[PDB]
């Protein structure tokens, strides 16, 4: 068995907003789980956040996790935004709530249960697991069955 949980994510959506989906692969206790759902009206970025939320929330105890994703949005948030957002109570400089605050807070909550390591892969230089997530995400976008109830046009 792997001594470190493994998660791989991608999200897909054309249209801002539009029908969108996500794929996520979770290696956890000898099992490999695959998550995927499509949403009727959403954004690419909200789908990349959702992928990670769903796969992390699958974890039922404290873990060491390696998260592999090619999202620039997730990468910026993690490496540039979240720390300064927290200090300002999840507001931008103009004192408004940050975009996708609902999903960022939910992701943050999940991140805070685990020892976390990030692998920022490129899209064309992805692993078999990342490619399969891309496939799942586009297939989910094609067949949406959920509501992205947190999505707002005005941020």
Curated annotation (Swiss-Prot):
Gene Ontology MF: a single term: nucleic acid binding
UniProt entry tagged with the keyword rRNA processing: no
The protein's required cofactors: Mg(2+)
GO CC aspect terms: cytoplasm
Catalytic reaction equation(s): Endonucleolytic cleavage to 5'-phosphomonoester
EC identifiers of the protein: 3.1.26.4
Coiled-coil ranges per UniProt: none
One record GO biological process: DNA replication, removal of RNA primer
Details of cofactor binding: Binds 1 Mg(2+) ion per subunit in the absence of substrate. Requires millimolar levels of Mg(2+) for maximal activity. Has low activity at micromolar concentrations of Mn(2+) and is inhibited at higher Mn(2+) levels. Can bind a second metal ion at a regulatory site, or after substrate binding.
Location of the RNase H type-1 domain: 1-142
Disruption phenotype: In a strain that encodes a retron, the msDNA is abnormally sized.
Residue positions binding Mg(2+) 2: 10, 134
PANTHER family: RIBONUCLEASE H1
Function per UniProt: Endonuclease that specifically degrades the RNA of RNA-DNA hybrids. RNase H participates in DNA replication; it helps to specify the origin of genomic replication by suppressing initiation at origins other than the oriC locus; along with the 5'-3' exonuclease of pol1, it removes RNA primers from the Okazaki fragments of lagging strand synthesis; and it defines the origin of replication for ColE1-type plasmids by specific cleavage of an RNA preprimer. Involved in production of retron derived msDNA (a branched RNA linked by a 2',5'-phosphodiester bond to a single-stranded DNA).
Protein family (similarity comment): Belongs to the RNase H family.
Name of the protein this chain belongs to: Ribonuclease HI
UniProt source species: Escherichia coli (strain K12)
Name of the gene this protein is made from: rnhA
